[PDB]
Amino acid sequence: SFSMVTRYAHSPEDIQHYDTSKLRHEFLMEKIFNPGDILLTYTYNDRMIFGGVMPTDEPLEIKLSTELGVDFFLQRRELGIINIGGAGAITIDGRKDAMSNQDGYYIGMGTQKVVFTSEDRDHPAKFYVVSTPAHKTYPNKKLPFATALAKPMGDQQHLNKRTIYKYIDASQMDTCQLQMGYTVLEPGSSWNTMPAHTHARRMETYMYFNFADPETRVFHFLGKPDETRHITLFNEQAVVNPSWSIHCGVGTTNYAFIWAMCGENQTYDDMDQVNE
Amino acid sequence: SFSMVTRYAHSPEDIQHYDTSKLRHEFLMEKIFNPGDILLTYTYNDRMIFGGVMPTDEPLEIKLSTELGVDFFLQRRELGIINIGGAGAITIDGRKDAMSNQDGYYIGMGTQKVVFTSEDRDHPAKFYVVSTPAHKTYPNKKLPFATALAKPMGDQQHLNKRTIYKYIDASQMDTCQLQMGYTVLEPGSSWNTMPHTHARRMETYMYFNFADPETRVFHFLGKPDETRHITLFNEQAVVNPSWSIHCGVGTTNYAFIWAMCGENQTMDQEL
Amino acid sequence: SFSMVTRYAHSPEDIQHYDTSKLRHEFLMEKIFNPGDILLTYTYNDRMIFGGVMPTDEPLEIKLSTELGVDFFLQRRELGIINIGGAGAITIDGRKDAMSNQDGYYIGMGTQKVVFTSEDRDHPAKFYVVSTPAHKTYPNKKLPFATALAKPMGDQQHLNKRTIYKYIDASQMDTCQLQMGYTVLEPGSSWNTMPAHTHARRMETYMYFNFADPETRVFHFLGKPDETRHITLFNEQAVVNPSWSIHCGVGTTNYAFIWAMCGENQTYDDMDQVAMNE
Amino acid sequence: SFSMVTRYAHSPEDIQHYDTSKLRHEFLMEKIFNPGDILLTYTYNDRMIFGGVMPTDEPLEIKLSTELGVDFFLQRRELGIINIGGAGAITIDGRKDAMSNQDGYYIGMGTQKVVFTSEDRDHPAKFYVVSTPAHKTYPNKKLPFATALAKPMGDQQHLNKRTIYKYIDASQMDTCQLQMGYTVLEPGSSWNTMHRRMETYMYFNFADPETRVFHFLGKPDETRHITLFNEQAVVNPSWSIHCGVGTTNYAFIWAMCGENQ
Amino acid sequence: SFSMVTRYAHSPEDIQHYDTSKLRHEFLMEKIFNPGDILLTYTYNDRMIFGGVMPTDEPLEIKLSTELGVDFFLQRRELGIINIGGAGAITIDGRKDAMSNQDGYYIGMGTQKVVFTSEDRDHPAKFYVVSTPAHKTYPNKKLPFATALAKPMGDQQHLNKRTIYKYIDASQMDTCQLQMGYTVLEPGSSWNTMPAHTHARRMETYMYFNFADPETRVFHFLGKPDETRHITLFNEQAVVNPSWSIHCGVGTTNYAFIWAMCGENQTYDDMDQVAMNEL
Amino acid sequence: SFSMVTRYAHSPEDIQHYDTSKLRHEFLMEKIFNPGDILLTYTYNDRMIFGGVMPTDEPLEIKLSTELGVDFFLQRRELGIINIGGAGAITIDGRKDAMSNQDGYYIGMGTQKVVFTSEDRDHPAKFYVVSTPAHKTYPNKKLPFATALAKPMGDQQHLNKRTIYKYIDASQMDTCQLQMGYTVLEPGSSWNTMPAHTHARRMETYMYFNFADPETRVFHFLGKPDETRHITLFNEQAVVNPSWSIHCGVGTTNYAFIWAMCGENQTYDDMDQVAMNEL
């Protein structure tokens, strides 16, 4: 009931002739949150590990030692966490801290044991986890949804009306590379990251969830800015966006997504704004 | 100048590995309205001819005989016309009839002379024209935008809020195969054909009246499981084979004229 | 015992690298007349429907309404029919009309029911049928073999010596689109369409039959005149020739074929002859 | 104006996706007989050398030593010759023997000098030449059109009616590997040949200027065709069928070699 | 005359049908040391930057701020340096340190200015440079060739006879992810890393130089252990080895190479060496 | 239990995009010597037949008549033989002649019956056999390992130190086309045919055997000099090298190989040397 799959990096040239089924296998995590299970992807775009943890009966922990060539999961890595599901808790080295819906956590490198548990097994917590390599330990921090700063953005004419939530951000805190945020599109607005960009020096992974209706789908565009493809996403699915690719998506209704960013810098304005 | 370019039909399998540059060449007409010229595409998806006529100083007529193996353009064909530009007139066999903005016209099989004129050379008429093969002559008809029937459709939740305008429609008139309509998405809505594949008919969409110059429309095609997209600037058109779905999304609101033909005038409802 | 398959149209570039098995699947109908069955093809080259209704005794009907988005098969289409087999019958709106060998029939737009029957189950009828979309009803007409003008053509030096028979022809009849003909090569001549002639404004389907002996084969050439491929045809097989392709064939012996043409014009002089090079 | 081109062999699998121009480049010799010239192709299907020599003003000899890794052309090879044009002669080591139209010749391994001449420069001899590697010297022999045993075959119903002329045939004579013959379809017949061995066909004597021959090659299930003008040649590897059909009648010289005679 | 070219990562599948010119373009840095120039590759295999700095007349420095989206080259990165050419010096923030032949250097995250100079313009220093992303400052260290620690290895029977030189090694020093070493093959031995290893969690870049005679070539094998390709190497050229690929080489004669390693761990035991079945 | 597989010729272009699995299928005979069996490959590069005959319980003969379109195997062909295994014998038309380890034999065109036997069932002879088309009968000849015609070649710096043994050679003997030799690399040298050559008028097949250790591997390079590939070999495997391809190999240890050559000439200097630039 634990799975971690490996995905290789590619050039723009390599994917040019991929069909939709090949694009989907290569860039799309089709199953993230499943009850009782840990589902993870390891991408060779900056060695990000991401997935979800949905504990029910037994408490769930990510135990990786020999698999990463290390003594314990976070020995050389750091970790972001956001709970998009029901009420639950994570205990960090024995200190149990409760996490409600949309509560975040940062866990710095060197932290040896993090255990994921849910309060009500029939409405469990869904922990979206993103781990990146780390050379420096920074203090663990809880990012409450309560104290999270909501910023409305976008207008109705451009169909981008949304609320942006800072979670793991170099302005509020210090991390090695990982950055994470939360974006809720208002009803009647489906476009995300519409003015698009390719930041060569970092990559992003988007995970789309909280779909308005079970019938909504999101079309995520990726690819070189002149050559764009799209992947159609159902609820609680994610797509990896390499450094050379634009990352944007359009919905049939409103939805929400978590983006995770990493690379060799945290500076937000290094991107090249994009004609496609 | 006059231009008519030819485009072949394809299988879904044939297009599966096309890169963006080849899809664009194959399914996308990138220049439709240019001043003084008539620009046309002939697609082997049901032999539709479509394009634009922008007369300014010299009246423009589509002169086709030997190219179509026929004595004059409309001997075996019918013709739709919609004016998306300035005020103008079409003279049908010497009879000049004025066409205001968004005025439509249908011209049945057998009409030997259609010449396009514009009122103001500096605000010319832009005539979007669609011709399909026709075996029966039906009366020519003027379709004023004034008397056209607007139908409100869509909500804000699904971002499809729009007004539907029937122009050449089998309920309002009789044509062999050709059908044409006009759809204006209200501000805050970019989705068109929010539902599909009609295996028994094909469609060509021409997008125009972009709200802002920065607007772009992403039109999806392909069988529903393997979908590709072409990104469109203002005043461009894309052909939808019978086997492909019809979708488009703008970054803002926009308008498009659809033109349909096929084996009937009467559709089955991704990745 | 009724079958209709769909086949998509293509560009020349699309087929340039097709292998031989792909060419056969895309352009070739491998079975037309089968006992008890009706087999049909729908080509996206001008939406021609062609095939055969090869009964045993009483039932055969083409049930197409919703599949074509219409109330009945011929509401928006017309239909040509040739009997290449034994004596049989088609019933038009309840009116049963018997068909001898090589008798033709045309049925205009709007005719609501046609049912195919044969007398002897052991000497059955083979009905070759071609339907194209139609916007105008035209009179049904009988194409008798007795009064069918035989037109001799070709010499032995060019191995094209043959008899040409007009059936559905714009000089003798009125149709929306469809045209059909019948050609019997004399023994010692197998070549058909000696200059190749691509006509951009219409397409053709060739159905080859009446092979001299069971071992004969016909090689049907297609493709742009510079890049030509060929499909090897057994008896009672058909090949779709898109507007952009030459249509040629040579047999190892004599044979016969029905050609069916449709498109946006009926003009026979609108073609580009391909001079003898390839 | 001496030419020899190299062409590699292939598997059936290799050609499956060749376009028309590629098959022609790989399997089709487009110019064989040009006045005054020798034109040759070296194919890696059994290292057959074939082409034509059309002497006009100057006598012509195929001079190959270093390129074939030998001291003279025929040191390790043998040579067949058929003259499809006007009267001529070959002087073999100074001994001149006249070659009329459709005269044959075999020249065994070890013969150092073959010189091709024609009487009239304005209706020259056309020498179609085929050479195969040879391990044993056999006598040089003239193969007259008269004494070349003709075998009639085919009927009009099958449009294959022709007379087959054996020239170099293991029944009348001995060679290392090479076998060569001459086949003329009668008027109103265009079909030809409706193996340890390969074949090279050179089609000529087209009835009318518009005649074309479609030569089929490939495995029996996957067949292609090449379109042939007059005086052109096509190689058929061991794994390929050998077929052709013309728009009129014509002639061809076949040359075969391989692991059996 | 500063160059940094970008090279993308690939799947094993992606390269399977690469022809010889394509393999070279994707995996081979063909020119590293040229007089007066800085030549660099940025590879999306763990974002390693490598190349050479060969100063002659004018002092040379790697100046990157906006291109990497940072304030200075080393703000988020660390830097290894080994001088394979003549005597020269690197001045770190104005503080000049001399660099003799085969002298090494490590420069930790945060040092703002490193300037490479050569003593004699006609026999310049050839500085091989390797930079990896770095989150933690560690002390700069000079690694003199004099005090380097050699380990002889291999026999003549396996043609692997060689001497190994520790330069940037977690035993002598602490770095974020970079590791670097130097290996000189004895005459009569051309094989490097012969029993071949994959380690999924780290990648390697090899730069081969000091070829015994001008005619020698090195054949570097890469690819999955079942599907292996090779690139043919002249003197002073380098090859990038993805985490999924083996690292091998054979010369027609002896030679030397510098290896540079990084990844998400520094543990050398993490690799799983493939038993000898290849292709 | 007789096998002969057929392999077609190719152009350089044809193989340029072959993957590893395809090259092996086209150019590599993976099993040659198996107890009790005849294993053979027919290549359309000059129609060479090669393989192995390992008699144990019953006598073995190569019976090919109608398959090659002849009455008996050698009617149009000649045959080279070298025994790399245990003690054995070939009986030529009833005349039994013994063959020890590394004993050779040439058998000319027209010999109707060649029968292979082994002395000890459990230490069988491994007869490596090579047949080429032949138009002329030449005398059968036994080629004892005793009279070796041995000769050392190469130096230690180039790792080619080796012994060359002439077997079927046009200076000592007369054959139609076939030429065969045996080359033993001394321990501490693995390179064969290192200065590499391509001869349009001849092709070669290498069969590698006597690997020093069970883990030894040989990397055989083939292809046009600019576009080169390689196949990695176990012990007792063979590789076909078309006229347009280089012939090279490197071992992880020493080994031996038997080369067999044919073509339209026997000239040993008709070849093109490859200057060391090969991509």
Ligand SMILES: [Zn+2]
């Ligand atoms: Zn981004």
Ligand SMILES: [Zn+2]
């Ligand atoms: Zn539609």
Ligand SMILES: [Zn+2]
């Ligand atoms: Zn035609």
Ligand SMILES: [Zn+2]
């Ligand atoms: Zn043959």
Ligand SMILES: [Zn+2]
């Ligand atoms: Zn390594």
Ligand SMILES: [Zn+2]
């Ligand atoms: Zn050689």
